[PDB]
Amino acid sequence: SGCSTVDTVKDFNKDNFFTGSWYMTHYKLGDSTLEVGDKNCTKFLHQKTADGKIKEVFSNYNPNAKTYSYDISFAKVSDFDGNNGKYTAKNVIVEKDGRKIDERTLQVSYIDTDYSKYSVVHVCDPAAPDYYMYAVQSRTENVKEDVKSKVEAALGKVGLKLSGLFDATTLGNKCQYDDETLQKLLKQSFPNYEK
């Protein structure tokens, strides 16, 4: 019980992964049937800087409530497990302006990625294992048709199929992403979490 350990991408290229932005297209969150409050449109921006810091800023938009939530993962190259797509991050839930609301530790496991199109991840809180997430992620709002099977294989490894996940792209026509806040918080200094 607790957080599941999943095999991860071998030879993780941080520099090509932690650049630009990603969209979360499909996902499973916990064991229970998904409620409308957990049906969100998520986009995140990240960056790895020379100092070795990794930073990821999430915009989570719930079309049903027309509300945004924001969180930021902070990690350092030295939090990664060797050369695998695996690491621990301090994830902070914040307001638009970056004020801390709550914080937790996440274990992030990249099951697979080709860097330029898609990634498949497992995220889990070692202190709240009932909060686990398996997610499909894309450089575009939809996963590009020509990698749909390369993705479905990855999900295969973890006992899942794409159709077995919430398709966030059913929200699409109502999906919104707070690019302004994303850009602003990425640049913004967080001395309580940097280092």
Domain ranges of the chain: 1-195
Q: How far is residue 133's CA from residue 122's CA, in Å, rounded to a whole number?
A: 6
Angle 96-115-83 from CA coordinates, rounded to 5°: 95
Q: How far is residue 81's CA from residue 37's CA, in Å, rounded to a whole number?
A: 33
Outline where DSSP puts E strands in 30-127: 41-48, 53-62, 67-76, 86-94, 100-113, 118-125
Q: Which neighbouring-strand residues pair with 57?
A: 45, 72
According to CATH, the superfamily of the domain at 1-195 is Calycin beta-barrel core domain (2.40.128.20)
Q: What are phi and psi of 82, to 5 degrees?
A: 60, -130
CB neighbour burial string for 66-105, b if at least 16 within 10 angstroms, e if fewer: eebbbbbbbbbeeebeeeebbbbbbbbebeeebeeeeeee
How was this model experimentally determined? X-ray
